[PDB]
């Protein structure tokens, strides 16, 4: 799949939004996957025991892996599908190290559309969120390309 440069024009105008504050954003982002997806936060050996949204909003560690995840995050889309220097060593890490399931990234693309719609609807409407959707789509089958090149389903 690709995306128009109309579709990448919504994709980055929001993201811009959460520019504004990435740790805030990044914040409700890893929440909202760890309470929709509990079995997520097993994956954070760091932080699997801040099983409630008031432990984890606690934690300034955890703020900063969100930080992390969504610049670089930003730093992928920015690329606009030209992405691959980018995933090689992403892909590796989580596949390898971290083993992340490619469903798992499905589930923190759904909590970053969520939490898009709760704080930026006037950026995210119908065409802005249709756009996104394919953008982290494009995301997750790249990364599952290389996952399967390191020998990993997802
Ligand atoms: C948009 C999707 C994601 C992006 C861009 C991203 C990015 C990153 C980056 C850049 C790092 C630091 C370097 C590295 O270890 O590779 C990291 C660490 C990590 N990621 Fe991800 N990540 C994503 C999704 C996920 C998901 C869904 C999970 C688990 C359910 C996860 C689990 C982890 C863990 C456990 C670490 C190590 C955290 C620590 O330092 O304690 N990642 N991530």
Known sequence: MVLSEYEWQLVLHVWAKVEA??????????IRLFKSHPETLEKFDRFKHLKTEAEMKASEDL??????????????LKKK????????????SHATKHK???K????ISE????VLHSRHPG???????GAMNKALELFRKDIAAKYKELGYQG
């Open 81 to 92: 599908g030209h992405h691959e220097a980018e995933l090689k060593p992403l892909a590796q």
């Open 123 to 129: 950026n995210f409407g119908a065409c802005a969120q």
């Open 104 to 107: 798992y990234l499905e589930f």
């Open 111 to 114: 909590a970053i559309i969520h």
């Open 21 to 30: 504050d990435v740790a805030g954003h990044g914040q409700d982002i890893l």
């Open 100 to 102: 992340i399931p490619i």
């Open 63 to 76: 703020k900063k892996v969100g930080v992390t995840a969504l610049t670089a995050l930003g730093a992928i």
